[PDB]
Amino acid sequence: SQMTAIKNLYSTVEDEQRKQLLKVIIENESTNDISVQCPTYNIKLHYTKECANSNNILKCIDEFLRKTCEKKHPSADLCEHLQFLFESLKNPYLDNFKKFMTNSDFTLIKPQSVWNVPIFDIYK
Amino acid sequence: VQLETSNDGIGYRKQDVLYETDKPQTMDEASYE
Amino acid sequence: MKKSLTFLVHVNSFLQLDFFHQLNEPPLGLPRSYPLSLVLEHKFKEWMNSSPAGFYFSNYQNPYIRKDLHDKVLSQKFEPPKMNQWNKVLKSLIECAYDMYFEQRHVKNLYKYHNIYNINNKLMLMRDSIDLYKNNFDDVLFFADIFNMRKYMTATPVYKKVKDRVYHTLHSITGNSVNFYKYGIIYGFKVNKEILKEVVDELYSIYNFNTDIFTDTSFLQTVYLLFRRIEETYRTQRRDDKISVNNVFFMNVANNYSKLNKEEREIEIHNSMASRYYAKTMFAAFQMLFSTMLSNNVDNLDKAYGLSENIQVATSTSAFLTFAYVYNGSIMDSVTNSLLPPYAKKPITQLKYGKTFVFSNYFMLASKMYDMLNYKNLSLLCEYQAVASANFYSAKKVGQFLGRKFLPITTYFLVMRISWTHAFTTGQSGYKSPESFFFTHGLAAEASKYLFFYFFTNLYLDAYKSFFNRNFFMELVNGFMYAFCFFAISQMYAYFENINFYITSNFRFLDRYYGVFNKYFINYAIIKLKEITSDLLIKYEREAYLSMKKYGYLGEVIAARLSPKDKIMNYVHETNEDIMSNLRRYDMENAFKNKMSTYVDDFAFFDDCGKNEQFLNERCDYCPVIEEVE
Amino acid sequence: LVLTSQSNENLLPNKEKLFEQIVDQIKYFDEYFFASGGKIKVKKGYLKYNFLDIYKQPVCSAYLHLCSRYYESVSIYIRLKKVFNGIPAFLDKNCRKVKGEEFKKLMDMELKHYIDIKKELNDEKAYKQLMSAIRKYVTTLTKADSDITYFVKQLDDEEIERFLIDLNFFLYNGFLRITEDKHLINADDVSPSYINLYRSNNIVALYILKTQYEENKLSEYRAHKFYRRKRVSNITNDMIKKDFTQTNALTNLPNLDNKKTTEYYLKEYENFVENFQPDLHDIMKLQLFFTMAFKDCNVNQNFTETSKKLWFDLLYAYDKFGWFYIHPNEVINSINKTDFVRHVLVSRNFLLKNNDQLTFLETQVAKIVEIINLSLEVDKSPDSLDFSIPMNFFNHKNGYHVMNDDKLKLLTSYEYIDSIANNYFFLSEYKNDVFRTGNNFKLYFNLPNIYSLAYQLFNELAININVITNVPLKKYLKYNASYAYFTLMNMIGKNHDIYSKGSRFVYASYILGLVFFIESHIDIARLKPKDFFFMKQSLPIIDHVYHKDLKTLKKNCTLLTDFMKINKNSQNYSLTHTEEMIKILGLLTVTLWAKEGKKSVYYDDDVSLYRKLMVSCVFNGGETIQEKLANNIEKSCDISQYGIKSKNLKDMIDINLSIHKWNPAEIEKLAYSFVLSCKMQKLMYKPMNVEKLPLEDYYKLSLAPDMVKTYHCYKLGKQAAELLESIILKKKFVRFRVTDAIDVYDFFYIKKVLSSRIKKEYNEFLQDKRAFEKKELETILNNSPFSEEQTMKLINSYECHWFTSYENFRILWMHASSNLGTGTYLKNFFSELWQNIRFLFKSKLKIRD
């Protein structure tokens, strides 16, 4: 689990200022909450320039990411992070991602939530 | 609004369901040694 | 008052086995002994699961297993496991671990082969704690001194006059440093039910008649000062010093203990215990007793079951659905005790090993108090908490790996996770105030409505398949939801190691929480329980369950967007005792300003902000203005 | 050396003599005391005697713990007589209302027509001024303190009266005022001592003695400056040798002059009673302390004529030369300045609650130190052997100095101290109350264990050490060694803590020094069961993963033998008698840590591995067995006949010790048999290689001695471990069944030589079991030069160790099933198979006649 993952992490980590910082977390597990929370990555893009021809916004970012993995745009971070992470997720998840840059039928971008109005919030 | 996704997380793999049942709650760790 | 509590099992008897199991060398060819509180924590978990009523709930997800449960319930072949079935197992477990001390290489040389006279005083005390526990194993309860307000004493002794009872002020009651005992020191005693009842009626006859001189929290204060004077009239220079009272490990028995007679050793164990422990035990008896004599709403709380289909039968569906709740109640959830900040955290939920062993013995104290006072339903309802105390390990492991959308159990503990953040999550100088955790909010009562409609749909669908839905089922919820008053109210009794929790204005919490819930439940009895058919019973289930999955989905949403730097959440989770006490008076006083209402509009915000209208984002009940002055 | 056993006829005059020393200590009780009814009387002829020169009398030296109770109860009675008779002189000058002659008329406790002042004085302005006047005199004596002097002034007029009533009640009647809480208290507990004042709630009486009579007169907070002053200079051994030279004992070693060391300790008993000149009534009460102290003369708890002579030596050793286990200057340097408040408060509680249990212990050592003197007086001629071997295989470096002569002996240094530890375990049929401290004439032959007595005081320390933390200090007791070593210094030194001051304990400290050090630093049985699991369970070895744990034994044992040195100085080091007797008493406590039951430490099977190799390590001067034997064999023979490289020499000695239940006395016989054989196989045979062995050279193993045989029987066991691990990982439970578990052993009985291509051979075995069996024999029987009747005898004579017993059959499966014992499905599946595999061993089982 996530509890085991931080315990598996504790062998790998090599700084005592980190190991003490990880020790107090693992030691206080039964008394205190521990949750793993991801950071957001924001996909910056020109909306009207990119999403003009694509059918969906879900379809649109796929046609954006395939431009960047094959390739300076400020989404250069994300396609590094994908190839880094899919290197760690060794056999099944690297192949379908490498297959993703070929097949246009594929959508990597998929909705995690049921979408309602408005789609975008336009910042006054 | 929630959309039920396929459970494939680190805590949420099918492998992790069986692994946490493989080790029982050891009396050694609950003693804090 | 002195004869009321007889301390059966001495500390330094039981302290040797749980705190000091490393010092005990095992008998030969046999592994190292684990501490006795862990073995009584871990065999308590394995007892429920081997006991047949616990077997069905741990396998409730398999449909072919649980139909064997429902068929026994309708045919009344079901009972929850009484703790009279537990104590017989406990007598064997303690006599093992006592004999696994007596078959040690070093005790057997001194104790077995030679005559017992004038042996080392532990080795006699390690014997007499068995011989007392064997004779009275059903009455013994076990307790742990977790919270201590210890003074400072200069360590060259002062002549103590015999008549001098030092604990006569509230300045002699107060503690400079506060010492938590997290590794646990467990001892035992016996409650004489009659002689206690002949005491606490006479104290209630003093308070009720002479209200001229007492208020609620003044009389509660001054009984505890008697319970420090009786604690001091047992203290002598022969047993212990000044310093050895404050330090538990410095306690021993009289140096002439081994030479005394069997009738004289047993009176010495009672005297040697209650020099240090007469306050905490006898006040724990008095706190539950004195509050429920005051509040007029206990009779209305126990005739809820007892008229139509009482739980004393213990085979009815009324007795099933209550225990079916409490086993998934998981008394105070292992998820939520990691959630609660340290001021509102119970002292008993801080033991490093042996939580369920203390809890299952703690709540059976509260059962005997209600069995004194003829509240035989609440005498039974405290047992269920003590009987379902085994799943404290289970409530932790549910949220880790068990399937979220699969288990109704998991969706229950995820909503109750958010119920301790209910007025907290609306924050999107902390302008919000901390909500009262001693109060149980609207989500907690709705979450127990889920497990009732989860189980009673699983019961009814097997009744129409195998085999007056209006007036019976109405008397079932009138039973069931007024149990949830009591499981929410008896949290206040768990904070019995300190007096300063109870001194607040909401001392009779049992009345003012009852009226808040009775206003809530009548407003639920009128509307949703107006029309009841079989079709509606399934209809109210998945209408709730989808909302419970909706309410359960909030914690995955809100927690990812949180920031550590809130000016209030640094302040709520403080551990400085001068800050720990400013909050425990605050949530008790500011308890009932909160309401039992759940709003659907809590997270829809107004996008436009008029500066005068900036309050409409906030949406708490009690919103005091907090203004930054520089 | 077991006193009860009547087996040995050479020692029966020696055993009978030792009892009549113990019976003779009744004669010292008879000569002063008379027993009339149930009350003990002084004899009528001894009414006039002062009893101040008891230290000159022999009954003090023969009853040390009793004579020390006496001169507490006399030194208190002298000093409180000086104070209370100081009052009417001082009442005149510093009180105006009541003068001292009025004080004498008020409280003379001779019967006229209790001594409550206020009902008799009946004058309130006098009373509050009199209580003011006494408080002035008590604060007069406590001038040297600020904190105690503060605590005296806070006392009421009523609370100072109870000091004055009880001080006068003591001097008139000789015993205290225990009237409060009286169910607990016996007869001796009333009797005056520094403990029994404190338990009696007379703390003001302690305040007087703390300031003006005894040292460290400052309070506890200033005591950190005190003990740093009582640090002394280090003493050179050439200073030490000037004292030991004048006497030589029976063991032909230097000894302290015993008439000097006795004369050193008696100065503290002389200065108690130097200038006291008794009245008529004073002798009547000095008899009362003499009856209360020497009521408890007993045949069991006496000091005999040897232990008497030694107990004064170590007091003179510790006070002058600083000769405890831990050096006394080391303890005070180990304390931090803030922590001296904690260390004293442990020694207050530890000595209060255990002064009865300690004074039982210090007598109970005195029986066993008497028998250690009996050990040296055993005739050692017939069990000696005249011839000697050039490397000491059987002599122990830390044995007796008598036994350390370089000759082989039939009874080594072990079996004596193994027999002394056997003295506790031979038991009479009927139970005895040895612990009863009253007067008994009977001589109880059962003796309680000196270790299990002293372990129960370890249990009381390690409780009272855990005041300082709420964590239980389970493994971490080794770092809180200072909280014990300061309590030890208060016992064997002068007990400077007057609230818990008792008699000095030497024998209790030299045991509780070693018992605490064994049960904290180097104990292994009570550490957590996963970690160091192998040393807790004596078993054969099949993989040598465990050698990193073996170096913790050498780390622990060399820490122990550094602890057991009485003198820490090694510049000009020289053994003495008193150090030797404690070193032998040091070896006793190590043995009683190990032995359970009448069987010896080396030969028992219940006792762990770790204790068997610890006890063997302490005798060898902190060398391990595996260090001792490898150093011996490599110089005594050329092992490269047997192909054993000198790196792996220590593994083989480890490998063969593991066979015979981890027995050092067994393998020492094996190794020297190997050394005797290694010299003779070298002349008459061509060398072999046991790490790389051919099939054709298997007959070389048949002629090999018992070490190299089983060291090659390991190599089959190691190989079968690495098949059965690799077969499971290959079959991954797809093809893994019971039938593989049979066939792994079926390769294991057949295969006799380590192979390079192991998995290749096993696939050849599954195809043809019988034809592969012929392939082993046809190679050996053809290629060995011996006849095939002879060669078949050499094969059948040798048996590999894993076959002969069920446990040695077992652990090959237990090696794999522990190496794959993570998951519940992984582990209980391996619990499933082993029931089926037990059916295999019945088929193999044969009997050799």
CSV table of N, CA and C in Angstrom, one decimal, chain C residues 286-378:
chain,number,residue,atom,x,y,z
C,286,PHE,N,-17.9,7.7,39.5
C,286,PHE,CA,-18.8,8.7,39.9
C,286,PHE,C,-19.3,9.6,38.8
C,287,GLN,N,-18.4,9.7,37.7
C,287,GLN,CA,-18.8,10.6,36.6
C,287,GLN,C,-20.0,10.1,35.8
C,288,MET,N,-19.9,8.8,35.5
C,288,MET,CA,-21.1,8.2,34.8
C,288,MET,C,-22.3,8.1,35.7
C,289,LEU,N,-22.1,7.9,37.0
C,289,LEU,CA,-23.2,7.8,37.9
C,289,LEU,C,-23.9,9.2,38.1
C,290,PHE,N,-23.1,10.2,38.3
C,290,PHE,CA,-23.7,11.4,38.8
C,290,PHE,C,-24.4,12.2,37.6
C,291,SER,N,-23.9,12.0,36.4
C,291,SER,CA,-24.5,12.7,35.3
C,291,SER,C,-25.8,12.1,34.9
C,292,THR,N,-25.9,10.8,34.9
C,292,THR,CA,-27.2,10.2,34.5
C,292,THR,C,-28.2,10.2,35.5
C,293,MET,N,-27.9,10.5,36.8
C,293,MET,CA,-28.9,10.8,37.7
C,293,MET,C,-29.5,12.2,37.5
C,294,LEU,N,-28.7,13.1,37.0
C,294,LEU,CA,-29.2,14.5,36.8
C,294,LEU,C,-30.1,14.6,35.6
C,295,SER,N,-29.6,14.2,34.4
C,295,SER,CA,-30.3,14.5,33.2
C,295,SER,C,-31.6,13.7,33.0
C,296,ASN,N,-32.7,14.4,32.8
C,296,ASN,CA,-34.0,13.8,32.7
C,296,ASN,C,-34.3,13.0,31.5
C,297,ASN,N,-33.4,13.0,30.5
C,297,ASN,CA,-33.7,12.5,29.2
C,297,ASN,C,-33.2,11.1,29.0
C,298,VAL,N,-32.8,10.4,30.1
C,298,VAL,CA,-32.3,9.1,29.9
C,298,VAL,C,-33.4,8.1,29.9
C,299,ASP,N,-34.5,8.3,30.6
C,299,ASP,CA,-35.7,7.5,30.6
C,299,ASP,C,-36.4,7.6,29.2
C,300,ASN,N,-36.3,8.8,28.6
C,300,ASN,CA,-36.8,8.9,27.2
C,300,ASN,C,-35.9,8.2,26.3
C,301,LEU,N,-34.6,8.0,26.7
C,301,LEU,CA,-33.7,7.4,25.8
C,301,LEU,C,-33.7,5.9,25.8
C,302,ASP,N,-34.2,5.3,26.9
C,302,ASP,CA,-34.1,3.9,27.0
C,302,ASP,C,-35.5,3.2,26.9
C,303,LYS,N,-36.6,3.9,27.1
C,303,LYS,CA,-37.9,3.4,26.8
C,303,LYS,C,-38.1,3.4,25.3
C,304,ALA,N,-37.2,3.9,24.5
C,304,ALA,CA,-37.3,3.8,23.0
C,304,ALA,C,-37.4,2.4,22.5
C,305,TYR,N,-36.4,1.6,22.9
C,305,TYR,CA,-36.4,0.2,22.6
C,305,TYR,C,-37.4,-0.5,23.4
C,306,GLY,N,-37.4,-0.3,24.7
C,306,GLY,CA,-37.8,-1.2,25.7
C,306,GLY,C,-39.3,-1.5,25.7
C,307,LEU,N,-40.1,-0.6,25.1
C,307,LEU,CA,-41.5,-0.8,25.1
C,307,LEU,C,-41.9,-1.8,24.0
C,308,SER,N,-41.5,-1.6,22.8
C,308,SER,CA,-42.0,-2.4,21.7
C,308,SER,C,-41.3,-3.7,21.6
C,309,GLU,N,-40.0,-3.7,21.3
C,309,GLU,CA,-39.2,-4.9,21.1
C,309,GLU,C,-37.8,-4.7,21.7
C,310,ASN,N,-37.7,-4.9,23.0
C,310,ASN,CA,-36.5,-4.6,23.8
C,310,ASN,C,-35.3,-5.4,23.4
C,311,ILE,N,-34.1,-5.0,23.7
C,311,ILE,CA,-32.9,-5.7,23.3
C,311,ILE,C,-32.6,-6.8,24.3
C,312,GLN,N,-33.3,-6.8,25.4
C,312,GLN,CA,-33.0,-7.8,26.5
C,312,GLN,C,-33.3,-9.2,26.0
C,313,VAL,N,-34.2,-9.3,25.0
C,313,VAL,CA,-34.5,-10.6,24.3
C,313,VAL,C,-33.2,-11.2,23.7
C,314,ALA,N,-32.4,-10.3,23.0
C,314,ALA,CA,-31.1,-10.5,22.4
C,314,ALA,C,-31.2,-11.5,21.2
C,315,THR,N,-32.3,-11.8,20.7
C,315,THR,CA,-32.5,-12.6,19.5
C,315,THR,C,-33.3,-11.9,18.4
C,316,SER,N,-33.9,-10.8,18.7
C,316,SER,CA,-34.8,-10.1,17.8
C,316,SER,C,-34.0,-9.4,16.7
C,317,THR,N,-34.7,-8.9,15.7
C,317,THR,CA,-34.0,-8.1,14.7
C,317,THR,C,-33.7,-6.7,15.2
C,318,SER,N,-34.4,-6.3,16.3
C,318,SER,CA,-33.9,-5.1,17.0
C,318,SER,C,-32.6,-5.3,17.6
C,319,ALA,N,-32.3,-6.5,18.2
C,319,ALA,CA,-31.0,-6.7,18.8
C,319,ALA,C,-30.0,-7.0,17.7
C,320,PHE,N,-30.4,-7.4,16.5
C,320,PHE,CA,-29.5,-7.6,15.4
C,320,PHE,C,-29.0,-6.3,14.8
C,321,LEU,N,-29.9,-5.4,14.4
C,321,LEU,CA,-29.5,-4.2,13.7
C,321,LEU,C,-28.7,-3.3,14.5
C,322,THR,N,-28.9,-3.3,15.8
C,322,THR,CA,-28.1,-2.5,16.7
C,322,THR,C,-26.6,-3.0,16.7
C,323,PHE,N,-26.5,-4.3,17.0
C,323,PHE,CA,-25.1,-4.9,17.0
C,323,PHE,C,-24.5,-4.9,15.6
C,324,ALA,N,-25.4,-5.0,14.5
C,324,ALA,CA,-24.8,-4.9,13.2
C,324,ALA,C,-24.3,-3.5,12.9
C,325,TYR,N,-24.8,-2.5,13.5
C,325,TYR,CA,-24.3,-1.1,13.5
C,325,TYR,C,-22.9,-1.1,14.2
C,326,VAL,N,-22.9,-1.6,15.4
C,326,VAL,CA,-21.8,-1.3,16.3
C,326,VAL,C,-20.6,-2.1,15.9
C,327,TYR,N,-20.7,-3.2,15.3
C,327,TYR,CA,-19.6,-4.0,14.7
C,327,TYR,C,-19.0,-3.2,13.5
C,328,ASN,N,-19.8,-2.5,12.8
C,328,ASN,CA,-19.3,-1.6,11.8
C,328,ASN,C,-19.2,-0.2,12.3
C,329,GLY,N,-19.6,0.0,13.6
C,329,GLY,CA,-19.3,1.2,14.3
C,329,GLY,C,-17.9,1.5,14.5
C,330,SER,N,-17.1,0.4,15.0
C,330,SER,CA,-15.7,0.4,15.2
C,330,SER,C,-15.3,1.6,16.1
C,331,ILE,N,-15.6,1.4,17.4
C,331,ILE,CA,-16.2,2.4,18.3
C,331,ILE,C,-15.8,3.8,18.0
C,332,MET,N,-14.5,4.1,18.1
C,332,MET,CA,-14.0,5.4,17.6
C,332,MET,C,-13.0,5.0,16.5
C,333,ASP,N,-13.3,5.4,15.3
C,333,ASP,CA,-12.7,4.8,14.1
C,333,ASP,C,-11.2,5.0,14.0
C,334,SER,N,-10.4,4.0,13.7
C,334,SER,CA,-9.0,4.1,13.6
C,334,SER,C,-8.6,5.1,12.5
C,335,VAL,N,-9.4,5.3,11.5
C,335,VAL,CA,-9.2,6.4,10.6
C,335,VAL,C,-9.4,7.7,11.3
C,336,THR,N,-10.4,7.8,12.1
C,336,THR,CA,-10.8,9.1,12.6
C,336,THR,C,-9.9,9.5,13.8
C,337,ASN,N,-9.4,8.6,14.5
C,337,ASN,CA,-8.5,8.9,15.6
C,337,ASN,C,-7.2,9.4,15.1
C,338,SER,N,-6.8,9.1,13.8
C,338,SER,CA,-5.7,9.7,13.2
C,338,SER,C,-6.1,11.1,12.7
C,339,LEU,N,-7.4,11.3,12.6
C,339,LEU,CA,-7.8,12.6,12.0
C,339,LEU,C,-7.9,13.7,13.1
C,340,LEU,N,-8.3,13.3,14.3
C,340,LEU,CA,-8.7,14.2,15.3
C,340,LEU,C,-7.5,14.9,15.9
C,341,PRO,N,-7.5,16.2,16.1
C,341,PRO,CA,-6.4,17.0,16.7
C,341,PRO,C,-6.2,16.6,18.1
C,342,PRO,N,-5.0,16.8,18.7
C,342,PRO,CA,-4.7,16.2,20.0
C,342,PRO,C,-5.4,16.7,21.2
C,343,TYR,N,-6.1,17.8,21.1
C,343,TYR,CA,-6.9,18.2,22.3
C,343,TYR,C,-8.2,17.4,22.3
C,344,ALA,N,-8.8,17.2,21.2
C,344,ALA,CA,-10.1,16.5,21.2
C,344,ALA,C,-9.9,15.0,21.1
C,345,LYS,N,-8.6,14.5,21.1
C,345,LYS,CA,-8.3,13.1,21.0
C,345,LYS,C,-8.5,12.5,22.4
C,346,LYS,N,-9.2,11.3,22.5
C,346,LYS,CA,-9.4,10.7,23.7
C,346,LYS,C,-8.1,10.2,24.3
C,347,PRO,N,-7.9,10.2,25.7
C,347,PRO,CA,-6.7,9.6,26.3
C,347,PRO,C,-6.5,8.2,26.0
C,348,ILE,N,-7.6,7.4,25.9
C,348,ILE,CA,-7.5,5.9,25.7
C,348,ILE,C,-7.1,5.6,24.3
C,349,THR,N,-7.3,6.4,23.4
C,349,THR,CA,-6.9,6.2,22.0
C,349,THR,C,-5.4,6.5,21.8
C,350,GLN,N,-4.6,6.6,22.8
C,350,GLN,CA,-3.2,6.9,22.7
C,350,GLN,C,-2.3,5.9,23.2
C,351,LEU,N,-2.8,4.7,23.6
C,351,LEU,CA,-2.0,3.6,24.1
C,351,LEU,C,-1.3,3.0,22.9
C,352,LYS,N,0.0,2.7,23.1
C,352,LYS,CA,0.9,2.3,22.0
C,352,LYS,C,0.6,0.8,21.7
C,353,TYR,N,0.2,0.1,22.8
C,353,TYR,CA,-0.3,-1.3,22.5
C,353,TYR,C,-1.3,-1.7,23.6
C,354,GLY,N,-2.4,-2.2,23.2
C,354,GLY,CA,-3.5,-2.6,24.2
C,354,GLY,C,-4.6,-1.6,24.3
C,355,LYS,N,-5.0,-1.1,23.1
C,355,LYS,CA,-6.2,-0.2,23.1
C,355,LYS,C,-7.5,-0.9,23.3
C,356,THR,N,-7.7,-1.9,22.6
C,356,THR,CA,-9.0,-2.7,22.6
C,356,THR,C,-9.1,-3.4,24.0
C,357,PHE,N,-8.0,-3.8,24.6
C,357,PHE,CA,-8.1,-4.4,25.9
C,357,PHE,C,-8.5,-3.4,26.9
C,358,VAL,N,-8.1,-2.2,26.8
C,358,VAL,CA,-8.6,-1.2,27.8
C,358,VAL,C,-10.0,-0.8,27.4
C,359,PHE,N,-10.3,-0.6,26.2
C,359,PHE,CA,-11.7,-0.1,25.8
C,359,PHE,C,-12.7,-1.2,26.1
C,360,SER,N,-12.4,-2.4,25.9
C,360,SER,CA,-13.5,-3.5,26.2
C,360,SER,C,-13.6,-3.6,27.7
C,361,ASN,N,-12.6,-3.3,28.5
C,361,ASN,CA,-12.8,-3.3,29.9
C,361,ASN,C,-13.3,-1.9,30.3
C,362,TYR,N,-13.1,-0.9,29.6
C,362,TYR,CA,-13.6,0.4,29.9
C,362,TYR,C,-15.1,0.5,29.8
C,363,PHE,N,-15.6,0.0,28.6
C,363,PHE,CA,-17.0,0.3,28.4
C,363,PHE,C,-17.9,-0.6,29.3
C,364,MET,N,-17.3,-1.8,29.7
C,364,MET,CA,-18.1,-2.6,30.7
C,364,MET,C,-18.1,-2.0,32.1
C,365,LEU,N,-17.2,-1.0,32.3
C,365,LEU,CA,-17.5,-0.2,33.5
C,365,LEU,C,-18.8,0.6,33.3
C,366,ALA,N,-19.0,1.1,32.1
C,366,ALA,CA,-20.2,2.0,31.9
C,366,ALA,C,-21.4,1.1,31.8
C,367,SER,N,-21.3,-0.1,31.4
C,367,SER,CA,-22.5,-1.0,31.5
C,367,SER,C,-22.9,-1.3,32.9
C,368,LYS,N,-21.9,-1.5,33.8
C,368,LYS,CA,-22.3,-1.8,35.2
C,368,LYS,C,-22.9,-0.6,35.9
C,369,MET,N,-22.5,0.6,35.5
C,369,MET,CA,-23.1,1.8,36.0
C,369,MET,C,-24.6,1.9,35.6
C,370,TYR,N,-24.9,1.6,34.4
C,370,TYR,CA,-26.3,1.6,33.9
C,370,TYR,C,-27.0,0.4,34.4
C,371,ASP,N,-26.3,-0.7,34.8
C,371,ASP,CA,-27.0,-1.8,35.4
C,371,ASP,C,-27.3,-1.6,36.9
C,372,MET,N,-26.5,-0.7,37.5
C,372,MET,CA,-26.9,-0.2,38.8
C,372,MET,C,-28.2,0.6,38.7
C,373,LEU,N,-28.3,1.5,37.7
C,373,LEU,CA,-29.4,2.5,37.7
C,373,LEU,C,-30.6,2.0,37.0
C,374,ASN,N,-30.8,0.7,36.8
C,374,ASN,CA,-32.0,0.0,36.2
C,374,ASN,C,-32.1,0.3,34.7
C,375,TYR,N,-31.1,1.0,34.1
C,375,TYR,CA,-31.1,1.2,32.6
C,375,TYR,C,-30.5,0.0,32.0
C,376,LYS,N,-31.3,-1.0,31.9
C,376,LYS,CA,-30.8,-2.3,31.4
C,376,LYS,C,-30.6,-2.3,29.9
C,377,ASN,N,-31.2,-1.4,29.2
C,377,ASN,CA,-30.9,-1.3,27.8
C,377,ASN,C,-29.6,-0.6,27.6
C,378,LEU,N,-29.3,0.5,28.3
C,378,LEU,CA,-28.0,1.1,28.3
C,378,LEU,C,-26.9,0.2,29.0
